[PDB]
Amino acid sequence: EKTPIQVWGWDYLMRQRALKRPIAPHLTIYKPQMTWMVSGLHRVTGCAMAGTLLIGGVGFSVLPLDFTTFVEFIRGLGIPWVILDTFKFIIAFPIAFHTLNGIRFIGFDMAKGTDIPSIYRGAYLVLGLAALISLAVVVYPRWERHKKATLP
Amino acid sequence: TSAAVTGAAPPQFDPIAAEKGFKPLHSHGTLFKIERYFAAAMVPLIPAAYFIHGREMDLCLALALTLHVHWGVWGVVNDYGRPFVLGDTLAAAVRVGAYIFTACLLAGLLYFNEHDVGLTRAFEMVWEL
Amino acid sequence: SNIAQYKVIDHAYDVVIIGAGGAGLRAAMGLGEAGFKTAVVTKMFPTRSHTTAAQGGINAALGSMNPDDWKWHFYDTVKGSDWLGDQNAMHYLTRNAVEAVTELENFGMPFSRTPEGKIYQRSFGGQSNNYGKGGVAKRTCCVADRTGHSMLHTLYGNSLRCHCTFFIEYFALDLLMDKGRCVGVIALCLEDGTIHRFRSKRTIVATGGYGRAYFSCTTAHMNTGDGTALATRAGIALEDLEFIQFHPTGIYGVGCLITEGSRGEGGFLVNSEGERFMERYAPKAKDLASRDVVSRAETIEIMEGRGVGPEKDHIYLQLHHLPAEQLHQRLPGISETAKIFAGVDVTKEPIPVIPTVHYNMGGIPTNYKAQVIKYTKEGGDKIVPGLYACGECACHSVHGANRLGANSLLDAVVFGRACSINIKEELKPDEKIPELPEGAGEESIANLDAVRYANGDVPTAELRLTMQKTMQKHAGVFRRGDILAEGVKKMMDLFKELKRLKTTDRSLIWNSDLTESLELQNLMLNATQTIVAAENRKESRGAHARDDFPKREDEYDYSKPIEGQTKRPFEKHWRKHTLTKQDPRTGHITLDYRPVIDKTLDPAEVDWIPPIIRSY
Amino acid sequence: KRIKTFEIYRFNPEEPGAKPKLQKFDVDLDKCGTMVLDALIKIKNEVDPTLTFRRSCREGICGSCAMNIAGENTLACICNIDQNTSKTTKIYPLPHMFVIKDLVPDMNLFYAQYASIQPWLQKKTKINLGEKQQYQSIKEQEKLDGLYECILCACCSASCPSYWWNADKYLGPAVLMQAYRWIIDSRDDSAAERLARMQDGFSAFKCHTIMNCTKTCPKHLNPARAIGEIKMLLTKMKTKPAPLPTPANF
Ligand SMILES: Cc1cc2nc3c(=O)[nH]c(=O)nc-3n(C[C@H](O)[C@H](O)[C@H](O)COP(=O)(O)OP(=O)(O)OC[C@H]3O[C@@H](n4cnc5c(N)ncnc54)[C@H](O)[C@@H]3O)c2cc1C
């Protein structure tokens, strides 16, 4: 149940349709900027996790396969440690970035930090702390396993 | 020559003609508050679950994430599931499929925690690679 | 309409306004409020009209800064006109000034404020307290540096509340004339290429000026004098065209205006010597002298080799001696504009400025009630029934030979409202909406088609570019009888090249090639009349100076005491309105002259102000 | 001679079965003004008169000449041409709007929506229209700074993705910031009912704080903040102060 303008607004679309007027390009022409790439990312990550959780939760339930045989399987492939800690970085960074940038957006929702510098710092600080935290969570235990391997 | 039709006023919005019989929509305001508050309260939860694992955590993530991602995808569906490009009922199908996505997310999660390692234990094991 | 087919559409309104500037809207507001079925026809969205680009402000004796009397405003208004001003219309204006501007504030216009919480007023050119004897006045209400933007936006908003049905991006073509009566307008809707006739009881013309008749100006690209061209084609003589106002501080390279408000805050003009030279040309008022006095002052310093810059061919406006706080709070707009176009930090350098075309006190002659008129020697003032006009496009005449700063936005809101009031009361619900004569607008369409398809050998940009250049050279700040004579000659030749015109875009739908060519006919009408009217005025009054006729020619000589002389005949002196009448097809013009209404509206309320020497 | 090139989006709705196109144009930079509008005019006058675009004020105040230059939504008239003649500047119209011709977008929803916030002053106690000024302090009216200077150019509405996808329901940055300017106006008694027409989850809540609006605005204003501000009120995390009381000697 719409507002009167939202009704008017619909009928307007129908008119512009009827006249067969083109729609001026947008994604394909608009300059990449920190403002909307970050938002883009914030969504892309948020959704992919949900996606993973649905493809994950429903996937192992509807298959005879379980999680232990899956982890078992890929260790069996004997794949370099560097590549495997990259795949860990790619799992952490989504959760790290989305959560940090979540607070940022809760800021912007309350008018806090909406000037053009606060937008551009808030952006780098978040990509920073999120990449920092995702390396710190991948390389720390990998540096604490190269101690058991090689130390007394 | 000028042997022509009597034409009409162009389409044009009257914000006073609009104000007769219009009754305000139930306010979305209260809801927007709890969506965000809820997200704010999950800010400590993610780091909590880094340190503390096990079955009580697995359960509190699944409950929280579901309810958060329920409101997430509802907003993402309302953005890309537009009548002007899908037609009316296909767009409504996508709105319904949002509530399906929410209730299959949970079932699969609940399943995963009750008949498999759980969310935390699952992360442990890929970090043990 | 030979070489093509044209959809046409008929409407039926109580009154059709041609304009969505300050005047137009304010009129339309009045009319809808009073339950008329009003149409507003405008060639662009109303927010885009020139009013939006006004900076300085709007005059009213509010006494928000120091006690004021609307009669001192009335004084300055007439002095500024140089006694060409019809004092009745100046009376109406200044009297209703305080109400008009208060209405705006009540409409939600976000004015700048004082510590007491009232409307902030700034000093501005040409004005003074106690009938020229007091100091420098302070009655120029403003929204900082963006007073027109704010007034138009406010006006536009309030027009949506009062049920005017808007016909936007409709190019008005001609008035619909039924043997001396105005029954409507014919227009080309740009969106869909159709042609629209509007039938109406009244018609208000509110179409702004013709600054694009010159190579340099402060005006918008749309300022092409379509309304005066509308009236010319409808067989109505225009008035006072030869008074083109040159604003002193337009930016040098570009034209963009720097407000007079920049001088009203404290800024001043400076030559190559570093002299604040206005103290020579006007010891009392200095840089706040009337615009024409200042513009000439600048134009001399240039001619006498004290111009500033590489060519020594412009002047500096100095603002960096003021506080930075005050430059942000009072002049944020031009602070920015100077930055963008001149590459100047106004807090650290001067802005290069030069006298620039700006306003047209000429226009469609009316009465004090805003009813468009005709004039013959014998019959006199003869109104044109159904027709009204207001704003830059009109000649009430409240500015005579020199516009007072901050008096156009007033003229627009006062006489805009005056059209609505003066129609609510002569139009009564008995009178039904006129029917159109057969063949109505047929020739407008014939012209349209001829221009649209035309294949001459001179393109529509080139013919314009010289019309503008001819005007800058021959009809500028200082004029001489031989230069003007050659001007008229060269100009009358360009009126013939209009048959050899070349257009390319053949479309009906949003053809900005075709519409800029209708503008060029409309300019040529206005331009040719401006230069002949000027070439014939052998005096020097207000914003019109002849080198070869440097004195002001009035009935008496007002430099000596009065009693003792004999009043010169009307044919000998020049205190009178020039009336150009042009034949649209042949381009031939004829002249005639109209007496200045010296009486006020109400002798009781205020006495008329007899002419004196005009020195600031 | 420095010959700069422009790829300009073109479309004509009279050619049957028409399609949008890019057209290259070469322009001598030393025969031409500094700003991008100067080039469009030059090209229209000397090369292709069909080339259709809006303009009026030359000083960046009207908002007629809004378009997408070099990726960003800005006004052409205060847009300095990139003199690096190796690259080519791309000029499309305001994104995602139905086009009428070339660089001219049908701006009619944008206007209708501006009408729908009711952009005018509303009073509970019928005022006598010409009689006296309404009190407002400096501080009260400086709330209006950053807000009343909107020229209605639509750069920002046309840069917001949400508004691309949902122009019909979401009012968008420019109309919303204007909505807020009639809400924090101390002189406006209708703060209450104004928020009632953006209660729904689409009118104002479809702002997903992307921040494209504040970034692109050629007048250096900020809608993203005004929108953020509009929510609280909607949430009730905030309310509008009552007017400062008008002194009795006024
Ligand atoms: C840069 C600048 C600054 C100024 N500053 C001030 C100031 O501080 N104070 C002051 O008092 N005055 C100022 N003026 C003068 C004043 O702003 C204008 O003279 C006044 O705004 C004119 O109002 P108007 O409604 O008559 O015409 P405009 O406001 O010029 O509007 C003209 C309207 O007529 C319409 N129109 C034109 N031709 C056609 C056609 N063929 N068909 C349909 N519609 C048409 C246009 O579309 C537009 O809607 C300034 C002028 C300029 C140029």
Ligand code: HEM
């Ligand atoms: C831990 C703290 C978290 C916070 C503070 C948070 C905050 C937010 C916020 C504010 C939004 C809405 C932004 C917008 O409207 O554009 C959002 C959207 C979303 N979040 Fe979260 N989130 C968190 C964790 C998660 C997690 C763990 C998931 C896991 C799947 C997730 C999935 C989503 C999804 C799918 C959206 C979709 C809506 C959109 O992108 O616009 N979020 N989040």
Ligand SMILES: O=C(Nc1cccc(-c2ccccc2)c1)c1ccccc1C(F)(F)F
């Ligand atoms: O659509 C969104 N980003 C999007 C989606 C698709 C393309 C582009 C895009 C691409 C290029 C330039 C500009 C925008 C941007 C988006 C992202 C986060 C929150 C809300 C939204 C939206 F409201 F639905 F618009």
Ligand code: SF4
């Ligand atoms: S906000 Fe900036 S961009 Fe959006 S309209 Fe007002 S001015 Fe144009």
Ligand code: F3S
């Ligand atoms: S670009 Fe778009 S969604 Fe909100 S904050 Fe800015 S409007």
Ligand code: FES
């Ligand atoms: S035409 Fe006024 S914004 Fe450039």
